[PDB]
Symmetry: D2
Subunit: 250 residues, 4 copies
């Protein structure tokens, strides 16, 4: 299935590891041009594999919590490529800020997760309008399931789903589609460890195993493509049945 | 139906007008004790009607964006009544902060809407655990429908639905239930041809929902008649969110 | 809270046992007039308690899978009361018809669950219009969660949620509201006996209850009834088309929690 | 994006017209082998275009309401190809059976829509297990939004969403995924052969399209098809039980927007 993403310039925040890394790599495979926005320089092995698929793929060091860096990196991206066709908002961290943490910790969690999704959309949208590009927001099942000690992250991830609907409405007349992907348990390098891994994996209905970053990536990249040309405002759960299937199943 | 809220102490933020005021008034009618947290003093006719139903009902001047006023007003409430049985997070404003507004405006919207729901829960939860009380978060249909130029408010309202699920999980073993009510179109102070256009789109009766309708579901959710309902989002919207957009 | 249900006539299908019995009893307590449609004659103690609260409450023997009996029982209710204010579609059974069972078993499950919800609404709605009455459909979390070997019941319960939206649209101009209640695990004497067919009943019950997030306990029929009766009342006068989950967090809270 | 569907055998019910036809054509483009089950012989031009992409693509005449024809058609497909990799349940018709129509009309609507999705899955699933294949159920936004005079179709389309969750649970250990696609307004020549009946056919088309948030236009069959075929493929290898709305924002975006 040709996705028609060849030479499409797509910013992927947190795009050099885990889910974001897999999204960048699939974009490169589809001959798109992923532009990684991340705090830390990607590892060599990642850059080797990416450039092999797409020699023009790039990385920009960006602290997403700095509004001016977001602005300048988008500008640099436009200066380098002349256009922007996609935005994948993906950077985030479950920082475990619960009910007892207080205002400052809560707001800091919003900064780490929610606020830069808005800032990136804010700076990218004029460019996306010009190309009738697309946005994918990566959220989390916690936005709808809760978890128990992570108000900050949960609030952020839920706000991102709401913003997906809001931006889909806001941008409809410009042909800019906005969708979300909702993962549940995804194995990354990052993420008695023999036992606790087994414990978590056991709860995923399809195959009792973690979702892979590639699985999230394939749905995310489909959503950026014109193969999803009448899909906007949607939240796609890629979670092995985690959110919606009977909690009682083994 | 006896809701068993008699002498139960419930804080209602933005509780002196619009939906909040209707919630406070219904609480008083059920012989609960509403404690109004609001920026401005309620008008006299409101306070008099409230006192008629519940002489122990109380108003505290609170700017909810001030974390210290939140903390101090809760402390006051506990000092006065010795208990807290409910929190209704209700204060908010659709401030029309869109994609072009920028970071500062977006964050100011979060402060006006989202952040004080968390601050209030933060300060109330220890006391709610003591009484196996309840929380009701008032959200907005915009959280799931979008609207077009209100990123700030939409984000906030959606985060409030998420937090309803999170806090329901967090507090399950303490017997504290957390639910949300989602209104669509409710005629309230500043809301009042442009009228008819909006009303016409509400499937049930082609009319606005009333504050009393929102209040009746919110108060039901605060009560032990909803003793196994937690984490839920109750739409009270005349069909606005879920019924065919094509209907007339 | 006054639900304003005094002398309101409400048919409750399967209304003498479990969830349905609790709804009938709650209706009587709110001074409504419940009309029980059920296959089996109710307990004497149930009838005594019902009459104690509402002397006008009635019971009619009805096999709901018989369309003519639905028709005639609604007709008799109208003859007795002259009006109908509510319908609670509640009768049903999880009959464990899997994907391997085949057409005949699947259709039989639809007859036991889905088809009489439609039949009852078909015969009741013309009367509900005159009174601006209401319908509550009792569904099941299985409609959205699945279960694994119950295609017939799952299909039925999901169709009941869809029909809740459909009828809400269809009846909007008549002021007739239609909503659904979705239970998960509700302890009833019937469930209690099914659990008794297991080797270690105590352990089976605990195993089921352990999965309910709020309190690790079954929902009670009264808990389902209180929401259902609230939804029948004008206290829910702008709620229509809705699916209310009364389930201790079963459907929507993190599967990973203990 | 390689979908890895080359030489995979996929039955598509109603697969020679509208959405079903687009699904078959996309399957053939991906070098899969679509097998069309439909009541009428397909257009010659359709058969030619299909054959150009996939010479092995087949059509079997099937009345899906006849359980034995479903059974035999699946058996013939296994006899021809020796495997089954996918099932797209797609055939259906909005027959406008309201609340007032009664039992016989309602049940007939279930037969036209719901019951053959079950029958087809019943006969296909034993084979899908061996290949760790997949099912896509095509539903309708009406399952969740209602419409107003179509209880039979609404109930059917909603049962199909519920069965998607149920079969996803049932088949999880066999690695068979089950998902649904929910369209809203899709232009098919047949929809056009219904719109044709109106006094001002283009003004009617316009009234409908004006309600679709994204572009104020109908979704195309290819747009539905591309999501459906993605769901059949291992690119969606951890997606199961899901309902994917492909509807230009119809179901979920603010009704107030123009
Ligand atoms: N991994 C899971 O199980 C899981 C589950 C649900 C949702 N998600 C979502 O997936 C998305 C990706 O997570 P992942 O697990 O791949 O994460 P990851 O931590 O493995 O990678 C995230 C990347 O983003 C970068 N990053 C984070 N914050 C940043 C900032 N402020 N500025 C610049 N760079 C920043 C990190 O350095 C890292 O490179 C997140 O939005 C997460 O919430 C993940
Ligand atoms: N009116 C509607 O149609 C509608 C629709 C959807 C959701 N809602 C929700 O209902 C809730 C109540 O809104 P409303 O329509 O009744 O507005 P209402 O303004 O007329 O009253 C809200 C009250 O909250 C107070 N308030 C607001 N911000 C405050 C702050 N920072 N500190 C202290 N007090 C503050 C206001 O002074 C006012 O008294 C809100 O959460 C809103 O999102 C309303
Ligand atoms: N108990 C639970 O855990 C649970 C969970 C989810 C949903 N539900 C739903 O609650 C509703 C009631 O269930 P319950 O658990 O109370 O069951 P129950 O069996 O205790 O009571 C059902 C009543 O309906 C009557 N009935 C059944 N079929 C009938 C027919 N064809 N004609 C006449 N009467 C008939 C039965 O005889 C019985 O009196 C059902 O719709 C069920 O699907 C129950
Ligand atoms: N067209 C829309 O706007 C729309 C909207 C929502 C959902 N859908 C869904 O999409 C699916 C396809 O609809 P479509 O619009 O492409 O339909 P269509 O009418 O254009 O084609 C349906 C095909 O299925 C065949 N078919 C129907 N019943 C059959 C039977 N009993 N036995 C054998 N073959 C049979 C028909 O002959 C026809 O060839 C249906 O499930 C429908 O509910 C369509
Ligand atoms: Cl991977
Ligand atoms: Cl009012
Ligand atoms: Cl009880
Ligand atoms: Cl097409």
């Amino acid at each position: 299935m040709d996705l028609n993403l060849q030479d499409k310039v797509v910013i992927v925040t947190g795009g050099a590891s885990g889910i974001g890394g897999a999204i960048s790599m699939r974009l490169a495979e589809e001959r798109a041009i992923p532009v990684v926005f991340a705090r830390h320089a990607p590892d060599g092995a990642f850059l080797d594999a990416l450039a092999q698929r797409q020699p023009r793929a790039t990385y920009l060091p960006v602290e997403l919590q700095d509004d001016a860096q977001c602005r300048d990196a988008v500008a640099q991206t436009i200066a380098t490529f002349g256009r922007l066709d996609g935005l994948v908002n993906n950077a985030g961290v479950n920082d475990g800020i619960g009910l007892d943490a207080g205002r400052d910790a809560f707001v800091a969690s919003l900064e780490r997760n929610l606020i830069h999704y808005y800032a990136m959309a804010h700076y990218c949208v004029p460019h996306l309008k010009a190309t009738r590009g697309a946005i994918v927001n990566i959220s989390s099942k916690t936005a709808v399931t809760g978890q128990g000690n992570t108000s900050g992250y949960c609030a952020s991830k839920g706000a991102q789903l709401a913003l997906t609907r809001e931006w889909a409405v806001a941008l409809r007349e410009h042909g800019v589609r906005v969708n979300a992907v909702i993962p549940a348990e995804v194995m990354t390098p990052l993420y008695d460890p023999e036992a606790k891994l087994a414990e978590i994996a056991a709860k995923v209905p399809l195959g009792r195993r973690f979702t892979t970053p590639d699985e999230i990536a394939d749905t995310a990249v489909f959503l950026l493509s014109p193969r999803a040309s009448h899909t906007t405002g949607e939240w796609l759960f890629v979670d092995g049945g985690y959110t919606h299937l009977d909690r009682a199943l083994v």
